[PDB]
Amino acid sequence: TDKNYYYLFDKKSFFNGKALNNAIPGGPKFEPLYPREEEEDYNEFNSIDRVIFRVPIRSEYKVAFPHLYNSRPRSVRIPWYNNPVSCIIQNDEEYDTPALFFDPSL
């Protein structure tokens, strides 16, 4: 019932992954849209001389902010970015009860 559960299991996310040839490890994988033209030629951009590696930049993050973390994204759809779902259902046959959470101060 929580919609936010499907984070990086959206259709959109899947599409993005497909585009970027980037498996969300749980999800599916495809033939890449574009052939990986490895022709950087040791340029002054994106070099390991230049950049810093505090974050590992996981491919989880690629399909979440496609246009940012991934460089030269193509045919990439935009994903969702959601609210949290506090929804409590009683399984013991009781009626309107603050069970799982805590009372106000005053």
Binding site: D2, N4, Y5, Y6, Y7, L8, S47, I48, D49, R50, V51, I52, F53, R54, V55, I57, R58, E60, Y61, A64, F65, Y69, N82, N83, P84, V85
Partner: protein, 90 residues
């Protein structure tokens, strides 16, 4: 720096029950740990560096990006007369 794919990561961890938001209105700067002006510094190129040499490495990277340091390996220091006061009197 450390907040790259923070929120997403959190979401992944928490099965989308916790939603992070990061912000910068306190304008709260802080010393990068470690100590700049160290030529020994760190071990790894590919991995994240250690914390004593963290400051240095970042600075170096920035320099490289700018085009201040010329080459694969370099340093940072004061340009003055008398060999920088004899390396600050040794």
């Amino acid at each position: 720096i450390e907040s790259a794919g923070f929120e997403t990561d959190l979401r992944l961890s928490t099965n989308g029950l916790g939603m992070c938001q990061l912000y910068f209105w306190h304008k709260i700067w802080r010393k990068v740990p470690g100590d700049v002006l160290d030529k020994d510094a760190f071990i790894p190129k590919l991995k994240p560096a250690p914390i004593n040499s963290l400051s240095r490495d970042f600075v170096m990277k920035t320099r490289r990006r700018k085009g201040i340091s010329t080459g694969g390996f370099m340093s940072n220091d004061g340009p003055t007369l008398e060999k920088y006061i004899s390396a600050e009197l040794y």
